Design an enzyme around this catalytic site. Structure first.
Site, PDB file in Angstrom:
ATOM      1  CG  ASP A 178      -3.384  -1.383  19.636  1.00 47.03           C
ATOM      2  OD1 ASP A 178      -4.401  -0.885  19.689  1.00 47.03           O
ATOM      3  OD2 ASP A 178      -2.650  -1.534  20.330  1.00 47.03           O
ATOM      4  CG  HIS A 190      -5.494  -2.902  22.748  1.00 43.06           C
ATOM      5  ND1 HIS A 190      -4.423  -1.625  22.518  1.00 43.06           N
ATOM      6  CD2 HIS A 190      -6.028  -2.366  23.954  1.00 43.06           C
ATOM      7  CE1 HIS A 190      -4.348  -1.048  23.853  1.00 43.06           C
ATOM      8  NE2 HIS A 190      -5.193  -1.395  24.430  1.00 43.06           N
ATOM      9  CB  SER A 226      -3.766  -0.252  27.285  1.00 45.43           C
ATOM     10  OG  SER A 226      -5.260   0.100  26.636  1.00 45.43           O
ATOM     11  CD  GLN A 227      -6.909   4.037  32.690  1.00 42.84           C
ATOM     12  OE1 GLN A 227      -7.077   4.702  33.308  1.00 42.84           O
ATOM     13  NE2 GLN A 227      -7.578   3.203  31.852  1.00 42.84           N
ATOM     14  CB  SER A 243      -8.804  -0.480  30.244  1.00 42.55           C
ATOM     15  OG  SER A 243      -8.169   0.732  30.102  1.00 42.55           O
TER      16      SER A 243
END
EC number: 3.1.1.74
Length: 197
Positions: A159, A172, A104-105, A26
């Site tokens: 995380d 993260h 992540s995303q 992101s």
């Protein structure tokens, strides 16, 4: 650097043996973000510059933070973009071994895309690496319809996105060492397992 469009720019007459498709996290820049370039450099060292094509997921994938909350952890438009890249790879270079990754995303995007992919193309992805996998708990550390042995998940203790939430904490952003060593190590090993040497 943060933008690599090797597959899109590449000549069909001179296809690389390995094609890596990667989705950034992101709010990250270019189409590779913070981790992608590190993985890329190591893949190039192993297979040579002409041996591997690095392709980030750009286009409709805006890596919008809010999209983490959508059903699949990303937008429908983003999934269509990544599916389109796998389809382009399959058409442009039918004999290339594919590898994928996401952070992540981008990890949710990679998982969703792979799940929806035509099995014939999905079966060509020799290995996939996921960092800070947002659907780690929900998917029990797996990518639906994809073998566990070809999957490697890097989820740091602390995380929170790996444990079912969408809270972003310091761990993260601590995947740098993994992107520089074990992630490309795994990808190289999975490619050599099927292509030989």
């Amino acid at each position: 650097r943060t933008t690599r469009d090797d597959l899109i720019n590449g000549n069909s007459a001179s296809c690389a043996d390995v094609i890596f498709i990667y989705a950034r996290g992101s709010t990250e820049t270019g189409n590779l973000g913070t981790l992608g370039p590190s993985i890329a450099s190591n893949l190039e060292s192993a297979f040579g510059k002409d041996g591997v094509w690095i392709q980030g997921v750009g286009g409709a994938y805006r890596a919008t933070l809010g999209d983490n909350a959508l059903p699949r952890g990303t937008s429908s438009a983003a999934i269509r973009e990544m599916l389109g890249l796998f389809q382009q790879a399959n058409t442009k270079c039918p004999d290339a071994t594919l590898i994928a990754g996401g952070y992540s995303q981008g990890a949710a995007l990679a998982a969703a895309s792979i799940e929806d992919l035509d099995s014939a193309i999905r079966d060509k992805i020799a290995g996939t690496v996921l960092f800070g996998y947002t659907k780690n708990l929900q998917n029990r550390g797996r990518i639906p319809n994809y073998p566990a042995d070809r999957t490697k998940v890097f989820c740091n203790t602390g995380d929170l996105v790996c444990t079912g939430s969408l809270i972003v904490a310091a761990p993260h952003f601590a995947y740098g060492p993994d992107a520089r060593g074990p992630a490309p190590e795994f990808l190289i090993e999975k490619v050599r397992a099927v292509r030989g040497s």
